[PDB]
């Protein structure tokens, strides 16, 4: 939902701010990369003939096989204020956003780009040994800080405030420490560019003027930039957030020139194998992956034993499992990490037996677990034995007259989120204390 | 004519009997019982009996592995 | 640490454990070996070249911790080092081989552990000159070190022959170990028992290797061999006797099993019962041939407090005759009080202890260091299972939900009577009723084990089915087993703590348990050994079933998991059966009536 979250934030952004964002070719290129192939086809079809088209022509062109994705593309196209659907002359005249259109046209023709590609200095240096290594150093420091092992190079103060204010790595000052939330463990499980998107989403959510379109345009040309070159130090807010993301380790800046590392391209797009972990009924780990980061993240929920060059070993204990469960880590998160670290031999055998049993029957008189459950279900039954309860504390009523208070003040209460427990035939249903706003008036009336 | 505040927990017969054992080794804490999946407890001592439930399964298994 | 090795930020939990300071050789690819410098725990890769060749020496010098599918776990121990140097494998050759097969430079801690595992082999030797322990040495050089120790009392001297058992331990701490390697061919004084076998018998290669274990030199090395159930261990012992060819006797603390090994012995061997004899609680008559066999029982030596003079004359006769070799069957019960006295009484020039499981409730299994010696051979359960030499078994655990009334009575019950109270849940009756319906629909032979003889009778009588416990008349017992085996119409049996052993039933294929002792890992494994010799083990589609009805919400969870972990160590995990299909599809559920549950609780209350 990453591009979906981006599109959602853009639709939250009001129409004229969006149109201000559609002014420049680099931003329009980034949004062009965001949109699905159908909407991309629509805008490239429209960009070279300036004719408002009725919707019925689009309906004639579209084969109904991709009609659902067509509707998704045009619904995003309309809600992003990028389409102008008006039923002029009775039929829905369709129009692409004109600022977006001309900026895409200039980007494609190589016309007026206003250095939205980048205000270049073009005094390039080596990036493998300076930029990549500085990026790796700073990002290693923040990754081990997000692991929880002590490390000297702490993050910056504004991103420390980001971790404090945000629900991501809650810096619990009563305990005095940063703490992994369940949202923090989801953040850990996220892809690298997903993590980048999470960081910028929280930072833009909390930052206020620091102009909003300055953030948007600057970030979009930051994604549009290339590697290993010097560039001119742009707006003032863009420059101060440029120095901020320099402190993030994103750019190697020599205090007007700056050298964007591999992370700009990582933000632009992504990139017995590495990370293929042999599961065991013995609950012993033969990982096909070794890093200090790997040991750092695996120590949170595994008793480990020793590190070799690719195979760091140890043992899963139920104490480690309960440690993870008490860390706020979801059992779903743990098992999701387990499919991210599955191994080819067991995968091949599971596929062969999957085809073998689907040749017999789909039911098989057993619960469904495609990966070998002897490592998994033993944890998963203990993971089923993790929570296994539910507690209501607060207001509670009982012994109703009839079912008059369950199909309209409990079904519509289900549509608004005010009750906690729904039991129609017991004549008792539990509500939250804060969610007593609109439960107890139609009960009175 | 009865609608009184209490902490209602969806429960099990076994942990219900454990709550009665809590009452046994220190009485008059838990208030009333509806069925095996509904008991009513002192809302002040909900966390007291939560940590006692924690030590209850600690006594149940205790999983040494040393 | 032979490195600088700035530690990882999370290497603190690698508490003397981050062994990456020692380098990786470029030969890490072909070689499989990683070495623990402190613990000595040894890593073996199953999908590596020459791992099959090196695993023999891995067993020879190290103990195997675990051998799963991918990466085997071993551990160097002084016991296995002593075994390897007793076989004869010198330190520099061993070091050269292990470093030639080691991915990494070898830890000098482990190297000097091997160097300190150097003994005075061939230097102390006890000879039994016709029931007279003459403790020779190969040189007078040993005598000067030995005389420093003063517990005692080329050169031999007087020792209390019972005190030999303790001074073997004493010489184990003072590190001059005696060896027992019989020169039977050079002992012309004992009469040889030249008995052969038939060519129709086929020795499996692991049995051949086991025979090679004590015959590295041809002298009869005395020690320990433990093999899985139904592996023809009787036949291996018969082969060992047929190649030793001297006067020899067989011991085991039972009667039915002992007479059936007498039958099996005289069946496959070429030795006539003229040379054989039997001595137990019933019959006490011996053979008078110069060489031969007295197959017998611990019963006739463990009790001398109250015996007939017939027993006295026979034990006098067998004590007077000096034997060459002895067989100690099911040796897991001998180190107790009246039981290891058989070792003190019997003087044979070679020993061997045998059992199905070398586990018990305590570490009296370490007494075999100074009782019966080192371990010579072992087989692998997964190896024989996938080779079809033993069965391929599905293991299952069945959690019975503990009902409310039995649960509250369980909480108000006293500690040692709580066990029967959780066992008497009617949900167990309902579940086993549906399971016996489903598996007799499947047509399976179903076996139930209970520690309580009365509860076993309760379940059998509720099912209207026969009962087998510890103290029943023998003719009733043979009637029931005759009906079950010979009669096809009789197929389901309820066994107990005398039916888990002392009888030979390879016919068992589906096994259930409901009760056992607190920590009876060994007795649990003896129960499971009944279906281990399920001979239908080579055809596809075979999967033997093991079940265990455990009442939930109990410390029976802890007890059952602690007992069944030994089988997991053998490689037998137990699948989950908590919610099952067909619980309601059976029309009748035993004490499904809440009033019936109350009446059953009333009955167990009245007994309580
Ligand atoms: Mg068997």
Curated annotation (Swiss-Prot), chain B:
GO terms for cellular component: cytosol; nucleus; transcription factor TFIIH core complex; transcription factor TFIIH holo complex. GO terms for biological process: nucleotide-excision repair; nucleotide-excision repair, preincision complex assembly; transcription by RNA polymerase II; transcription initiation at RNA polymerase II promoter. Keywords: DNA damage, DNA repair, Nucleus, Transcription, Transcription regulation. InterPro entries: TFB5-like_sf (IPR035935), TFIIH_TTDA/Tfb5 (IPR009400). It is found in: Nucleus. The keyword Nucleus applies. Gene3D superfamilies: TFB5-like. Pfam families: Tfb5. Component of the general transcription and DNA repair factor IIH (TFIIH) core complex, which is involved in general and transcription-coupled nucleotide excision repair (NER) of damaged DNA and, when complexed to TFIIK, in RNA transcription by RNA polymerase II. In NER, TFIIH acts by opening DNA around the lesion to allow the excision of the damaged oligonucleotide and its replacement by a new DNA fragment. In transcription, TFIIH has an essential role in transcription initiation. Component of the 7-subunit TFIIH core complex composed of XPB/SSL2, XPD/RAD3, SSL1, TFB1, TFB2, TFB4 and TFB5, which is active in NER. The core complex associates with the 3-subunit CTD-kinase module TFIIK composed of CCL1, KIN28 and TFB3 to form the 10-subunit holoenzyme (holo-TFIIH) active in transcription. An additionnal subunit, TFB6, plays a role in the dissociation of the SSL2 helicase from TFIIH after transcription initiation. Interacts with TFB2. Belongs to the TFB5 family. This is General transcription and DNA repair factor IIH subunit TFB5.
Curated annotation (Swiss-Prot), chain C:
Residues 430-584 form the Helicase C-terminal domain. Residues 214-376 form the Helicase ATP-binding domain. ATP binds at residues 227-234. Optimum pH is 7.25 for helicase and ATPase activities. Its EC number is 5.6.2.4. It catalyses: Couples ATP hydrolysis with the unwinding of duplex DNA by translocating in the 3'-5' direction; ATP + H2O = ADP + phosphate + H(+). Keywords: ATP-binding, DNA damage, DNA repair, DNA-binding, Helicase, Hydrolase, Isomerase, Nucleotide-binding, Nucleus, Phosphoprotein, Transcription, Transcription regulation. It comes from the Eukaryota. The modification Phosphoserine is found at residue 593. It is found in: Nucleus. Belongs to the helicase family. RAD25/XPB subfamily. Component of the 7-subunit TFIIH core complex composed of XPB/SSL2, XPD/RAD3, SSL1, TFB1, TFB2, TFB4 and TFB5, which is active in NER. The core complex associates with the 3-subunit CTD-kinase module TFIIK composed of CCL1, KIN28 and TFB3 to form the 10-subunit holoenzyme (holo-TFIIH) active in transcription. An additionnal subunit, TFB6, plays a role in the dissociation of the SSL2 helicase from TFIIH after transcription initiation. Interacts directly with TFB6. This is General transcription and DNA repair factor IIH helicase/translocase subunit XPB/SSL2. It comes from Saccharomyces cerevisiae (strain ATCC 204508 / S288c). The chain holds residues 100 to 767 of 843 of the full protein.
């Amino acid at each position: 939902s990453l591009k979906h979250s981006v599109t959602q934030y853009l639709e939250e952004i009001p129409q004229q701010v969006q149109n201000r964002l559609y002014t420049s070719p680099a931003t329009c290129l980034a949004i062009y990369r965001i949109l699905p192939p159908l909407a991309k086809f629509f805008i490239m079809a429209m960009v070279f003939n300036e004719n408002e088209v009725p919707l019925l022509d689009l309906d004639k062109w579209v084969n109904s096989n991709g009609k659902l994705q067509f509707q998704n593309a045009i619904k995003s196209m309309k809600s992003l204020h990028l389409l102008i659907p008006n039923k002029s002359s009775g039929t829905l005249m369709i129009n692409l956003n004109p600022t977006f259109k001309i900026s895409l046209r200039n980007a494609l023709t190589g016309g007026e780009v206003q250095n939205s590609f980048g205000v270049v200095v073009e005094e390039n240096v080596v990036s493998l040994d300076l930029l990549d290594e500085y990026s790796a150093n700073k990002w290693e420091t923040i990754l081990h800080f997000m692991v929880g092992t002590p490390l000297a190079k702490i993050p910056s103060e504004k991103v420390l405030n980001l971790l404090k204010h945000s629900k991501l790595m809650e810096e619990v000052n009563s305990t005095g420490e940063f703490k992994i939330t369940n949202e923090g463990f989801q953040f850990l499980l996220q892809e690298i560019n997903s993590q980048l998107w999470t960081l910028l989403l929280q930072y833009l959510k909390m930052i206020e003027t620091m102009d909003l379109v300055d953030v948007l345009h600057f970030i979009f040309m930051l994604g549009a930039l290339e590697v290993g070159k010097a560039y001119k130090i742009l707006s003032e807010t863009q420059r101060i957030m440029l120095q901020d993301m320099r402190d993030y380790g994103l750019v190697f800046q020599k205090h007007s020139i700056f050298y964007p590392t591999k992370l700009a391209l990582m933000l632009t797009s992504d990139t017995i194998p590495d990370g293929s972990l042999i599961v065991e009924t013995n609950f012993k780990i033969y990982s096909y992956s070794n890093s200090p980061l790997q040991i750092a993240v695996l120590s949170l929920f595994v008793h480990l034993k020793a590190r070799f060059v690719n195979m760091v070993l140890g043992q899963i204990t139920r104490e480690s499992i309960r440690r993870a469960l008490t860390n706020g880590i979801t059992a779903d998160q743990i098992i999701a990490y387990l499919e991210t670290h599955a191994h080819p031999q067991m995968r091949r055998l599971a596929e062969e037996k999957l085809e073998k049993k689907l040749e017999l029957d789909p039911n098989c008189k057993e619960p469904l677990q495609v990966l070998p459950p002897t490592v998994v279900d033993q944890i998963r039954l203990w993971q089923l034995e993790l929570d296994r309860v539910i507690t209501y504390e607060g207001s509670l009523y009982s012994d109703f007259e009839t079912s008059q208070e369950y199909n309209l003040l409990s079904k519509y209460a289900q549509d608004i989120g005010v009750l906690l427990w729904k039991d129609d035939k017991k004549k008792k249903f539990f509500i939250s204390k804060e969610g007593n706003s609109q439960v107890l008036d139609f009960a009175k009336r | 004519a009865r609608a009184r505040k209490g902490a209602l927990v969806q429960c099990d017969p076994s942990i219900k009997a454990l709550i009665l054992q809590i009452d046994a080794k220190m009485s008059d804490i838990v208030l009333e019982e509806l069925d095996d999946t509904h008991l009513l407890v002192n809302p002040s001592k909900v966390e007291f009996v939560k940590h006692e439930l924690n030590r209850l399964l600690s006594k149940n298994i205790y999983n040494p592995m040393d | 640490i032979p490195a600088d090795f700035v530690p990882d930020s999370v290497s603190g939990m690698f508490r003397s454990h981050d062994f990456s300071y020692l380098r990786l050789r470029p030969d890490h690819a072909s070689r499989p070996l990683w070495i623990s410098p402190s613990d000595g725990r040894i890593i073996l890769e199953s999908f590596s070249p020459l791992a099959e060749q090196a695993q023999d020496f891995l067993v020879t010098i190290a103990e195997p911790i675990s051998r799963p599918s991918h990466i085997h776990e071993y551990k160097i121990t002084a016991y296995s080092l002593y075994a390897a140097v007793s076989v004869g494998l010198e330190t520099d050759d061993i070091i050269s081989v292990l470093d030639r097969l080691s991915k990494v430079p070898v830890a000098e801690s482990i190297i000097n552990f091997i160097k300190g595992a150097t003994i005075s082999y061939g230097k102390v030797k006890l000879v039994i000159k016709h029931n007279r322990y003459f403790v020779e040495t190969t040189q007078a050089d040993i005598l000067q070190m030995l005389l420093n120790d003063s517990v005692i009392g080329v050169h031999s001297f007087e020792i209390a022959n019972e005190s030999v058992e303790v001074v073997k331990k004493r010489c184990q701490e003072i590190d001059y170990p005696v060896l027992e390697e019989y020169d039977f061919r050079n002992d012309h004084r004992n009469p040889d028992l030249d008995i052969d076998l038939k060519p129709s018998t086929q020795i499996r290669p692991y049995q051949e290797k086991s025979l090679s274990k004590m015959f590295g030199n041809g002298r009869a090395r005395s020690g320990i061999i433990v093999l899985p159930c139904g592996a023809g261990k009787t036949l291996v012992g018969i082969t060992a006797a047929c190649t030793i060819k001297k006067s020899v006797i067989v011991l085991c603390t039972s009667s039915v099993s002992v007479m059936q090994w007498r039958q099996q012995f005289l069946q496959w061997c070429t030795l006539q019962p003229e040379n054989c004899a039997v001595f137990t609680s019933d019959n006490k008559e011996m053979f008078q041939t110069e060489s031969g066999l007295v197959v017998s029982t611990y019963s006739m030596v463990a009790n001398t407090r109250n015996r007939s003079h017939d027993s006295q004359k026979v034990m006098d006769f067998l004590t007077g005759r000096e034997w060459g070799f002895i067989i100690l069957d099911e040796v897991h019960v001998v180190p107790a009080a009246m039981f290891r006295r058989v070792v003190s009484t019997i003087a044979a020039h070679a020993k061997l202890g045998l059992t199905a499981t070398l586990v018990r409730e305590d570490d009296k299994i370490g007494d075999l260091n100074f009782l019966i010696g080192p371990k010579l051979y072992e087989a692998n359960w997964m190896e024989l299972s996938q080779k079809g030499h033993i069965a391929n078994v599905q293991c299952a655990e069945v959690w019975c939900p503990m009902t409310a009334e039995f649960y509250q009575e369980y909480l108000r019950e006293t500690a040692r009577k709580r066990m029967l109270l959780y066992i008497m849940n009617p949900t167990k009756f309902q579940a086993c009723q549906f399971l016996i319906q489903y598996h007799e629909r499947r047509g399976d032979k179903i076996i139930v084990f209970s520690d309580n003889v009365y509860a076993l009778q309760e379940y059998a009588l509720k099912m209207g089915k026969p009962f087998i416990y510890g103290s029943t008349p023998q003719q009733e017992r043979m009637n029931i087993l005759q009906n079950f085996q010979y009669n096809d119409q009789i197929n389901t049996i309820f066994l107990s703590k005398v039916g888990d052993t002392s009888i030979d039933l390879p016919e068992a294929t589906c096994l259930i348990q409901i009760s056992s002792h607190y920590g009876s890992r060994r007795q649990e494994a003896q129960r499971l050994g009944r279906i281990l010799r399920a001979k239908r083990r080579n055809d596809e589609g075979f999967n033997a079933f093991f079940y265990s009805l455990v009442s939930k919400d109990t410390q029976e969870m802890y007890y059952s998991t602690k007992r069944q972990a030994f089988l997991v160590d053998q490689g037998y995990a137990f699948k989950v059966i908590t919610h099952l299909h067909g619980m309601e599809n059976i029309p009748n559920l035993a004490y499904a009536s809440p009033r019936e549950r109350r009446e059953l609780l009333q009955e167990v209350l009245l007994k309580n």
